[PDB]
Amino acid sequence: TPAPSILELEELLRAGKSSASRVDEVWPNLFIGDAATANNRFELWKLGITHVLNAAHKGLYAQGGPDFYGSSVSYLGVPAHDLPDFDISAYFSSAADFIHRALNTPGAKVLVHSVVGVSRSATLVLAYLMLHQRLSLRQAVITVRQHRWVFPNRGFLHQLARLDQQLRGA
Template identity: 50%
Template sequence: GAPLSIPQQPYLTGSQIKLEHVLDSCRMELNHVDEVWPNLYIGDILIAHDKEELRKLGITHVLNAAHSTWESKGDQAFYGQEIHYCGIAAEDSTNFNLREHFYPASDTIHLCFSFSGKILVHCVVGKSRSATLVLAYLMIYHHFSLTDAVQRVIQYRAISPNRGFLKQLQDLDVELRDRTNLCELL
């Protein structure tokens, strides 16, 4: 017979292994929605499609990291006038470049807060794509290191960004740290 092919796992660095241990230390149950920062919620597709529950939570903005996937019916027409909608057609794949969406998504979250709004960031399950975008927001706008951002979010929600997304967040972490160090030198 044909030889069995072994799927290639990306090589993990020491810092990635430490991050995965931090993520694995979370003992939270996975809920449909959790507030992980004041007025910032991470959720799944079920909460995103429950307009009554969103109204009860006071959600004014929805950032859908699974826009145009077959499970997601969310778009501006679905939410009507009550909720501002932003969709990112991201795949939960280690090869997908979510990094190009880190700054636009963070700006969307920040803009929501400038209107005293509440935002739901969601994907299908609410633990990889949406969590990655929220971690990037905490790093970009609140100057958290990646580890600090992860430790903050897992106090409120079980998250599990895929390894490709973790690598992209680590690259962002290095870039932000280098920028901070450069500013201190100037």
């Protein structure tokens, strides 16, 4: 079965959740959210978030230790731009390892976020699902789309389909 075309991807992406929420659990203890969500440390505390992957990080790519004040014990900042020519695939492995290590830690919960929680953040979660949860791209999309409306840009879609080809041997 070949990897899906961009057109097919986009049709898969539009079929799921008609919903606007700021943050959604899309896989056990794994959340995708927006900037508003990431910038309210009290609500992250209420949610039980222990690990934060900012897919729209401003600055150099960087990991962080525990938050000066907040509940977060570990931060990863991926300085992606939401552009089709941006090489987000360079961060798939490191982002996916961060997520994996956290979800294999009893009691941890991970929030991956970006400005609107639609493209940069979802792209990394899709790659995680493919890398570590044995899912094809289509299956990663079907998984996520039930719980949040997501829509990686076409450049990112290409990169995820390349990854789907590499992992499955097309």
